[PDB]
Amino acid sequence: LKRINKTAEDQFLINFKAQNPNGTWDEFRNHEQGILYKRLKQHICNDQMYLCAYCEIDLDRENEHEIKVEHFKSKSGSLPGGSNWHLEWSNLLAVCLGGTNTGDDFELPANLSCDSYKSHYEDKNKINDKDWTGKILLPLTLPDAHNFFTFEKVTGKLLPNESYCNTISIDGKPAAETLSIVTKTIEVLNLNCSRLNNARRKLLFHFNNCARERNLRKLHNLLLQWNQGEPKFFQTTRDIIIRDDRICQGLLNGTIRY
Amino acid sequence: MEQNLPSRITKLIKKSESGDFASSYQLYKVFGSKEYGVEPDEKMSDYFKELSAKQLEGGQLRVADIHLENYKGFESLIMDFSMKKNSTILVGNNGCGKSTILDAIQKGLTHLSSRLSTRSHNGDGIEKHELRKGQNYASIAINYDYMGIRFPMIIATTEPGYEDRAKSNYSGINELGSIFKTAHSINPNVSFPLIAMYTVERANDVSTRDIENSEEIKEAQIWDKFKAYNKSLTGKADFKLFFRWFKELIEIENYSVNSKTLHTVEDAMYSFLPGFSNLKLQRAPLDLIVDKNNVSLSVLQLSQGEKTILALIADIARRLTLLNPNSVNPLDGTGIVLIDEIDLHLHPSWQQNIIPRLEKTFKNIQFIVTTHSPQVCHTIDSQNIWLLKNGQKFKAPKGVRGAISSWVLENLFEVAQRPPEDKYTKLLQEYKNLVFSEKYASEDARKLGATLSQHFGPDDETLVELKLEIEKRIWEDDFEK
Amino acid sequence: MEQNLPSRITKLIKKSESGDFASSYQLYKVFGSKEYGVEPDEKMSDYFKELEGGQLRVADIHLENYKGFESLIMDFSMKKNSTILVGNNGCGKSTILDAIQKGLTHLSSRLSTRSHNGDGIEKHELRKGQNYASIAINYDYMGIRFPMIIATTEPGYEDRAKSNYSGINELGSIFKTAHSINPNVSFPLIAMYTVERANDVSTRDIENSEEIKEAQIWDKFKAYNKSLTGKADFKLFFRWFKELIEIENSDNADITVNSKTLHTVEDAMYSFLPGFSNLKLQRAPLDLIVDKNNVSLSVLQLSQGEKTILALIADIARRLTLLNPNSVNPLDGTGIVLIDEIDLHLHPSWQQNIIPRLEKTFKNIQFIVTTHSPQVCHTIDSQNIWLLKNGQKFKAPKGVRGAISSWVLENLFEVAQRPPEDKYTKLLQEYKNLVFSEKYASEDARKLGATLSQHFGPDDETLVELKLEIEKRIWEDDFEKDQ
Numbered sequence A: 001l002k003r004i005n006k007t008a009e010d011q012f013l014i015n016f017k018a019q020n021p022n023g024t025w026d027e028f029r030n031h032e033q034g035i036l037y038k039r040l041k042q043h044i045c046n047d048q049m050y051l052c053a054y055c056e057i058d059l060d061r062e063n064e065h066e067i068k069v070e071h072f073k074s075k076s077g078s079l080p081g082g083s084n085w086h087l088e089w090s091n092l093l094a095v096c097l098g099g100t101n102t103g104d105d106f107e108l109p110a111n112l113s114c115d116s117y118k119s120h121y122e123d124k125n126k127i128n129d130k131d132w133t134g135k136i137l138l139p140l141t142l143p144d145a146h147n148f149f150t151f152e153k154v155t156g157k158l159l160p161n162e163s164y165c166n167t168i169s170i171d172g173k174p175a176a177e178t179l180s181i182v183t184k185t186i187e188v189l190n191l192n193c194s195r196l197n198n199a200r201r202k203l204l205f206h207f208n209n210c211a212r213e214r215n216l217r218k219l220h221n222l223l224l225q226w227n228q229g230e231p232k233f234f235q236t237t238r239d240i241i242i243r244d245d246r247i248c249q250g251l252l253n254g255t256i257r258y
Numbered sequence B: 001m002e003q004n005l006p007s008r009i010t011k012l013i014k015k016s017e018s019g020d021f022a023s024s025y026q027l028y029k030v031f032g033s034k035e036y037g038v039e040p041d042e043k044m045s046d047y048f049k050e051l052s053a054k055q056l057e058g059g060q061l062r063v064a065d066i067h068l069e070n071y072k073g074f075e076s077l078i079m080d081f082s083m084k085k086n087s088t089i090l091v092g093n094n095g096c097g098k099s100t101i102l103d104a105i106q107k108g109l110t111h112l113s114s115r116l117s118t119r120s121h122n123g124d125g126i127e128k129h130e131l132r133k134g135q136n137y138a139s140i141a142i143n144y145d146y147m148g149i150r151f152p153m154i155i156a157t158t159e160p161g162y163e164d165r166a167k168s169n170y171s172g173i174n175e176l177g178s179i180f181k182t183a184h185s186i187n188p189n190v191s192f193p194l195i196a197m198y199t200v201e202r203a204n205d206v207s208t209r210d211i212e213n214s215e216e217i218k219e220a221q222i223w224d225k226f227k228a229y230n231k232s233l234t235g236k237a238d239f240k241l242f243f244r245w246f247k248e249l250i251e252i253e254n255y256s257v258n259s260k261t262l263h264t265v266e267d268a269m270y271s272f273l274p275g276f277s278n279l280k281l282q283r284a285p286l287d288l289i290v291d292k293n294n295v296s297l298s299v300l301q302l303s304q305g306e307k308t309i310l311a312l313i314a315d316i317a318r319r320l321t322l323l324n325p326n327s328v329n330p331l332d333g334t335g336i337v338l339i340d341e342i343d344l345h346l347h348p349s350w351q352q353n354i355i356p357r358l359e360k361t362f363k364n365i366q367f368i369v370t371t372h373s374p375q376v377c378h379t380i381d382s383q384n385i386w387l388l389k390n391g392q393k394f395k396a397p398k399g400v401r402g403a404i405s406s407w408v409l410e411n412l413f414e415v416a417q418r419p420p421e422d423k424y425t426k427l428l429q430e431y432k433n434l435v436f437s438e439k440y441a442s443e444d445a446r447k448l449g450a451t452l453s454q455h456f457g458p459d460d461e462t463l464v465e466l467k468l469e470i471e472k473r474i475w476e477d478d479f480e481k
Numbered sequence C: 001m002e003q004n005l006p007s008r009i010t011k012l013i014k015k016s017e018s019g020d021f022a023s024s025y026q027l028y029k030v031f032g033s034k035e036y037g038v039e040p041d042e043k044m045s046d047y048f049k050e051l052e053g054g055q056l057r058v059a060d061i062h063l064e065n066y067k068g069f070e071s072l073i074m075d076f077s078m079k080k081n082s083t084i085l086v087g088n089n090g091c092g093k094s095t096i097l098d099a100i101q102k103g104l105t106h107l108s109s110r111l112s113t114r115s116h117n118g119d120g121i122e123k124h125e126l127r128k129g130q131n132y133a134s135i136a137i138n139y140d141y142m143g144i145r146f147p148m149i150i151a152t153t154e155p156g157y158e159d160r161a162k163s164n165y166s167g168i169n170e171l172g173s174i175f176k177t178a179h180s181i182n183p184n185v186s187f188p189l190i191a192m193y194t195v196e197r198a199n200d201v202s203t204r205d206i207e208n209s210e211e212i213k214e215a216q217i218w219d220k221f222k223a224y225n226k227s228l229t230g231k232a233d234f235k236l237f238f239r240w241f242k243e244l245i246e247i248e249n250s251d252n253a254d255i256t257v258n259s260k261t262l263h264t265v266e267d268a269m270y271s272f273l274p275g276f277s278n279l280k281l282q283r284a285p286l287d288l289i290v291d292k293n294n295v296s297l298s299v300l301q302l303s304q305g306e307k308t309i310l311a312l313i314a315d316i317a318r319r320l321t322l323l324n325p326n327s328v329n330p331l332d333g334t335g336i337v338l339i340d341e342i343d344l345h346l347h348p349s350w351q352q353n354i355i356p357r358l359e360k361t362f363k364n365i366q367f368i369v370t371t372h373s374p375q376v377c378h379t380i381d382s383q384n385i386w387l388l389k390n391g392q393k394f395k396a397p398k399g400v401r402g403a404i405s406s407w408v409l410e411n412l413f414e415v416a417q418r419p420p421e422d423k424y425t426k427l428l429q430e431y432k433n434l435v436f437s438e439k440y441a442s443e444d445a446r447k448l449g450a451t452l453s454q455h456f457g458p459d460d461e462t463l464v465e466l467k468l469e470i471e472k473r474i475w476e477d478d479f480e481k482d483q
């Protein structure tokens, strides 16, 4: 889920909170119209480089209607006088549509992923306490170089790991049981669904077609395109593929050079 | 002011005075009685109903929603059809229930047909065999849409010996029948809503074997508008009366009706059937003649798919021409045509064009249909494909229109793209495991790779990808040593 | 030469020391003037002329001016028992099957009770134009060819075609002689099932009490009573079920064996239908009750697919049960069972298992099924799939036994993977041509990409390749031109 860094507020989410202590998200959307909502979406997406926090896919840069904003701690869990979990600018994330367009509540659970299957899980197993912080990975406070995810090249699934899961701790939990946190993070959002396991398996196709030529220069060009900056879609899986190839790893650290 | 409030009445009646049909119907819903703040005045309400009778020009009788409780395998399922896309397709597994909804809609229309025809009898209720085992009541609540006013209808049956709870309030079908009867009264040349139903038994009617002996030619069938609904809400269609119709029209051809209706009906199957032209009758042995690519064949040995697609569109066109009076475009009227099992005796090159051809030929017709072949499915948007499963409705995944057959299978029909237990696909899975498991070329991957290469050839897509993987990994063993 | 034929003395010794059926069968003709008319003595053809495990299998066929075909030759396989003829709806697929029907009716006739006939080429079944028509069929029982030809002349041109119904009379004689030695001898399962299999099961036809009222006696030739018309006689199956259950009730009332056939027939049906168990007869107003997952339903309310499968399998199981008395495995026998449109009223999942399950439960049975659905085609080898296109035979490409439905659909059916007039496939092609060109990142390209991504989503497999290649081109072009 990468590691997204937020910069600062722009004194326009401050004024709305100042004029209205309690939080109702639909009130913010149905404000003086699109202006504030447009600019909040823009400023949120630019911090994420126009990518989704949960499932790394390319959000359209010229069509808002394909861009949605998801509250990490669900907006159904706000408590009067307890918290303001609708407008704090540390719970806002930019997410895709998740396999649905109108939210009819009659779409297949297996297809739904990224963000909507979070709500589906909450309804299905009746998660009363919407305090996901601690059980599902937060794409705002993770380590910047995570060895969490192993790319199973057979089916394209993202699977837990033994190493690096008993070393680092998240949300103050004991570091000896982060494996359960990662497994539930996979389960709640279904990063391992059909429409993403059959989309991450084609980056492997690209990486292996850029190696048919048996030319190390083309592989060099591929590495400097996939590991330069301005993250593109599915950047995490890109990094896993580069890290699982010993020729590539050797190229980036001396031995085996052109 | 006539002592009545002139504000809301004038707000909602200006379009009615202009000619809008919905506003007059809305007025004659509360003006006559006392249900809204309007006084119980019966002058303007009756004038409005009489005027609204003569305001229907272009509309569409369409089923909007259906609500079933304990009807046939369904505990509760509330459909919501489309008022913009004129095609709804139901998809699912045989056993979940699709003919249940089709039969419910047919039962609903069995009373509307009687209400619109000259008769006034009732249709059919819920039979004893159409109640769930260990259950006491059932309901077939259905609503309809004319030019824009909702019209309800409930057909419910309860066992007297257990409980008496449900009712049967037909209601709006009587009002619709009143509108159409008054429309006929003012002018007999007025279009009527078609109603049709086509079960899996359409095939068992097409035969010109002793028409004189069998039926429907030894009579004096008067060709009118009200009685065109004969056997319309049943299974097998009407081909013998079809042949009677050709006989009469061609023989009278020898004014304008012969040149118009016969030509249009011919063009229907001329467009649907690619290569069947120059229809004509046979007089001595009393059969039909078709010219398939300039060779003449009767209707007793044509292809079964051609037979079915002939009878289907032929019946639809015949009833549309009978229900409609003198008009330039007589196949563009209105109706609710239910066609169970559209993918019946058809080739995968016609299943991808059956629906667009139906919509381009008959424009303003609703086509609630059930299918079981993906090629039919991915010709229509996902918003109009229901995936009835385990007694509850799930809508089709996003982006079905213009998709591929394998994806439609996997993500909508719950069927694996490759065969599930074919020995070669299991060998393919074992090969795919061995390639990615850091154990290639250990005398057990090469034999299996050769075995799969001998069957699919060296050109199968997936095998080429595994070959790319093994080639790249054998590259790795070079520079690391 | 002669006197044991020193040229073939060893061959004659081999036939003498038969110890089998093939080596003791042709000896009848060998001692009955095989080479040329000589030595017609019946003593030689008494111990070398006068059967456990066989396969009455159609081997080939030849059609001349019958229906749309003008000349066509098939050769059905012998080791593997399946044939899945596929073709365009209109060119022809029922002509072959109806030809085998006209051929097999005479066999079923001449082995049922007596040698007679009843099917010949009709006038409407004649090629428009061409006068002479012939339907040649040749069987194979334990590796012996039995020819058979039918003929008909339109303007009395009794010169170009004749009907030599020979050899099949010999086959009928062999079967009848086998019956004479022992009545308990197995017979084939000549049967056909047209596109109207299940248009006989009805709730009123479950009630009955007014349709079949007679004293039908079950014999071996009962299976040949209306077995080639194109219907599954579910009513007679229901009668047989009622008789079996009532005799079981009589037996266990006298109690206060002979029922294993009922268990076998029910087990044949329970395998194909999933979760359907506890089949029982209702003596209360006459019905049949089927239990589906602890829910007791009736035949009247089963869906179309279950009705069709139940009718077909019940008919086949009943016929083989009658035809194979006192058999530890009654449902093996042999047959040339023909089925038309085995992909009718079936779910895509059920279609993927319809052929292997039939071939497993009924192993020694031939099927010449015809299919329109690609899902059925990718379960059997390509050497057994025969494509009928433009009145000729073309063999299917290799690699069909397991394959993606798209490949079979676009190679054996000549149908595009995507709709060819849909306004979201033309846009796909118009965008893909732009992507694989020098006008990438053009404004129209961006508009089309956005339009396609809004519909198919941003993770469709086709879209991912296009966006990756756009990234490739933008990286390569900008980096090189700046340098």
Ligand SMILES: Nc1ncnc2c1ncn2[C@@H]1O[C@H](COP(=O)(O)OP(=O)(O)OP(=O)(O)O)[C@@H](O)[C@H]1O
Binding pocket: B071, B072, B073, B074, B093, B094, B095, B096, B097, B098, B099, B100, B101, B129, B130, B131, B132, B133, B340, B370, C292, C295, C296, C297, C301, C302, C303, C304, C305
């Ligand atoms: N009264 C009932 N009692 C028990 N089971 C029932 C009852 N009514 C319906 N069912 C179950 O629900 C199923 C409904 O079958 P149905 O014919 O509606 O399937 P369908 O796929 O929608 O129709 P079709 O095959 O023609 O497309 C039955 O097969 C049966 O299993």
Ligand SMILES: Nc1ncnc2c1ncn2[C@@H]1O[C@H](COP(=O)(O)OP(=O)(O)OP(=O)(O)O)[C@@H](O)[C@H]1O
Binding pocket: B292, B295, B296, B297, B301, B302, B303, B304, B305, C066, C067, C068, C088, C089, C090, C091, C092, C093, C094, C095, C096, C124, C125, C126, C127, C128, C340, C370
């Ligand atoms: N006497 C004839 N003259 C001309 N064409 C004929 C004649 N008899 C049959 N045909 C041809 O036979 C074709 C249709 O016959 P057929 O029933 O075999 O096709 P089919 O749809 O594949 O059958 P099925 O789907 O039931 O297996 C027509 O194209 C028709 O031209």
Ligand SMILES: [Zn+2]
Binding pocket: A052, A054, A055, A056, A057, A095, A096, A097, A098, A114, A115
């Ligand atoms: Zn997403």
